[PDB]
Amino acid sequence: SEALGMIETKGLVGSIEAADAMVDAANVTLIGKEHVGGGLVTVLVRGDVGAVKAATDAGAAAAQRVGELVSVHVIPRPHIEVETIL
Amino acid sequence: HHHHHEALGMIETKGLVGSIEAADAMVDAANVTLIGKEHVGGGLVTVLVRGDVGAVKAATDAGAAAAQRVGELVSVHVIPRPHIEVETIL
Amino acid sequence: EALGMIETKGLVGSIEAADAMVDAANVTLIGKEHVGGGLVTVLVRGDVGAVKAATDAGAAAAQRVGELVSVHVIPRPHIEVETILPHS
Amino acid sequence: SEALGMIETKGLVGSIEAADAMVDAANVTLIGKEHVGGGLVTVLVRGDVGAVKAATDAGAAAAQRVGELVSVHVIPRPHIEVETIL
Amino acid sequence: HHHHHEALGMIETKGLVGSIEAADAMVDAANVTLIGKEHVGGGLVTVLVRGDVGAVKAATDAGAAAAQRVGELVSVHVIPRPHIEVETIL
Amino acid sequence: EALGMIETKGLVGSIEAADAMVDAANVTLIGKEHVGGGLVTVLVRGDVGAVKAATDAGAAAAQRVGELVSVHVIPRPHIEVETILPHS
């Protein structure tokens, strides 16, 4: 159960910049991006807890510089059931 | 038409992050099954769980509190005995 | 058959409206429609009396958990309107 | 080139009620309904000018009673090119 | 990359009614071809026309005024010599 | 290659941004993405210098006809980011 990191922005540009800054900051896997309507876009990463925390911190700061940051969160040990909605 | 003669728990958020956190907290809090998530546009996302009523109430209480900390909570509800017809819109 | 509809902002209000409608009267839940902006409509069909009882119960239930936008009953819809509705 | 009548609402309920009131008020053809996002829904009718004006007036009043009316308009003699976006 | 070595007119509205009225007024005002309409979500709708620059300017001016009377006008623009690459997003 | 992006509220601002970008420099217009809520992004690829010139021109052009939301250049995108981008 690898850690899960997520950044949500209003607008795609902030999310693409967040994804690039996340993989630049640490060895994390980019799971993908999700569009939920209303302009909201989420990018998600997986990896060891330390790497996910470093990646999400870098991604949140990068997204805030170019777009609108909405949320930033890390789940260090997600439950296996959560994989069914990722 | 009732199933017998399981309870449904739901949390709706504005944004996916609050829903992923709600889903994780729900399955962590009690013996419930995560049924899935629905996007209805306008940024609204709903995550649904099934199980015995006591487990669904404990899971939704934990999921509502968790979603509010990281995102925007919109609704939280438990239907103890949902009609089978409601499955057609889940 | 009469047509009953409840529109909410958010899916949770619509799931609760649909459950309260089928619980209150013998109506057929046709389904749900998403029109964007968070708006969701649930539609039922049945005899006029059943549809009125179901929609009244559904509207009150939806308002408790979410945001009720509209509630309406068309007792005898024109056949042309069926061409723009969802069907079972 | 039959007249074109249109009613736009915020929400589907107002548009279904508008469509029923339009066909109830006059001999018009319901072309269909369109969802453009943001909750906006448009219902369109065709027929002779007099019938379309009566139908759209009835549909606007009916939609306003149950939902949110946004726009109401009649084009008495639409250009043939407009059929390509209907 | 230019087409030669036609002009594009566009009107964006919030709601379909303003766009249908803009399209009708545009083709009525001048010799332009209605290319189509695009929905981008959030209620925004764009209608596009092609023709000689003078015709496109006359058509967009008429369409902008007509859309504002019945709905919500958001944008109005003419590109006299659009690059062929822009066709990939029209 | 460098990646340039311009996000607007409305399609008109994005069509004008795309035209001004290809007019200003030799960049490849990858396409456009709609993420809901009226937000539209247009993306270009090319050498860093060309992408910076194109995005600067596109941002100024989009602001004149519509609502500019974001403008950004990533000079050397990580290979992983290509998996979430549109491609030609």
Instruction: Report chain B residues whose CB lies below 8 A from the CB of C35.
Output: 41
Of how many residues is chain B composed?
Answer: 90
CA distances in angstroms from B25 to A50, B67, C68, listed in the order given: 21, 9, 28
Cα separation, C25 vs C50, whole angstroms: 5
Name the minimum distance, in Å, from the CA of A57 to any CA of chain E. Answer: 30
For residue D36, what is the nearest residue in chain B, using CA coordinates?
Answer: B41
Name, in order, each residue with C-beta under 8 angstroms of A40's C-beta and a sequence gap of 6 or more. A8, A9, A10, A70, B14, B15, B16, B43, F35, F36, F37
Which residues in F have their CB inside 8 Å of a CB on E? 9-16, 18-19, 22-23, 28-29, 31-32, 34-40, 42, 65-66
Instruction: Report chain B residues whose CB lies below 8 A from the CB of C19.
Output: 79, 82-83, 86
For residue A38, what is the nearest residue in chain C, using CA coordinates?
Answer: C37
Instruction: Report chain D residues whose CB lies below 8 A from the CB of C35.
Output: 11-12, 35, 39-41
User: Which strand ranges, in their side-by-side order, compose the sheet holding C67-74?
Assistant: C28-34, C39-46, C2-9, C67-74
Instruction: Report chain D residues whose CB lies below 8 A from the CB of B40.
Output: none
Instruction: Report chain F residues whose CB lies below 8 A from the CB of A40.
Output: 35-37
Cα separation, D49 vs F12, whole angstroms: 33
Taking CB atoms and an 8 Å cut-off, how many pairs form between chains A and F?
76
Buried b (16+ CB within 10 A) or exposed e, D49-83: eebbbbbbbbbbebbbebbbbbbbbbbeebbebbe
Would you say E85 and F44 are in contact if contact means Cβ atoms under 8 Å apart? no
One-letter identity of residue D55: A
Instruction: Report chain C residues whose CB lies below 8 A from the CB of B44.
Output: 9-11, 38
| Cross-chain Cβ contact E23/D85 below 8 Å | yes
Would you say D31 and D85 are in contact if contact means Cβ atoms under 8 Å apart? no
Chains that touch B (3 or more CB pairs under 8 A): A, C, D, F
Q: Which two tokens stand for residue D63?
A: 């939609």
- CA–CA–CA angle B88, C35, C83 (5° rounding): 75
Q: Which two tokens stand for residue C50?
A: 């059943």
Q: After which residues do gaps appear in chain E, with C to N over 2.5 Å?
A: 5
CA distances in angstroms from F11 to A13, B10, C14, F31, listed in the order given: 15, 35, 32, 12
For residue B84, what is the nearest residue in chain C, using CA coordinates?
Answer: C19
CA distances in angstroms from E58 to C47, E11, E30, E31, listed in the order given: 55, 13, 6, 9
Method: X-ray
Where would I find the beta strands (DSSP E) of chain E?
Answer: 7-14, 33-41, 44-51, 72-79
Instruction: Report chain B residues whose CB lies below 8 A from the CB of A56.
Output: none
* Annotated domain spans of chain F: 1-88
Name the minimum distance, in Å, from the CA of E55 to any CA of chain C. Answer: 36
Which of these, D18, B47, D21, D11, lies nearest to C6 by C-alpha position?
Answer: D11
Q: What is the resolution of this structure in A?
A: 1.9
Name, in order, each residue with C-beta under 8 angstroms of A31's C-beta and a sequence gap of 6 or more. A44, A45, A46, A86
Which residues in C have their CB inside 8 Å of a CB on D? 3, 5-7, 33, 35-39, 41, 69-72, 74, 77-78, 80-81, 83-85
Chains that touch A (3 or more CB pairs under 8 A): B, C, E, F
Name the minimum distance, in Å, from the CA of E62 to any CA of chain C. Answer: 30
Name the minimum distance, in Å, from the CA of D60 to any CA of chain E. Answer: 13
Would you say A45 and A22 are in contact if contact means Cβ atoms under 8 Å apart? yes
Q: Which two tokens stand for residue A40?
A: 């909201």
| Cross-chain Cβ contact A36/F36 below 8 Å | yes
Q: How many CB atoms lie within 10 A of CB F75?
A: 13
Residue of C9, C44, C72 to mutate for D, most D C-beta atoms under 10 A: C72
Residue of B11, B17, B27, B72 to mutate for A, most A C-beta atoms under 10 A: B17
Taking CB atoms and an 8 Å cut-off, how many pairs form between chains D and E?
74
Instruction: Report chain E residues whose CB lies below 8 A from the CB of C36.
Output: 41-43
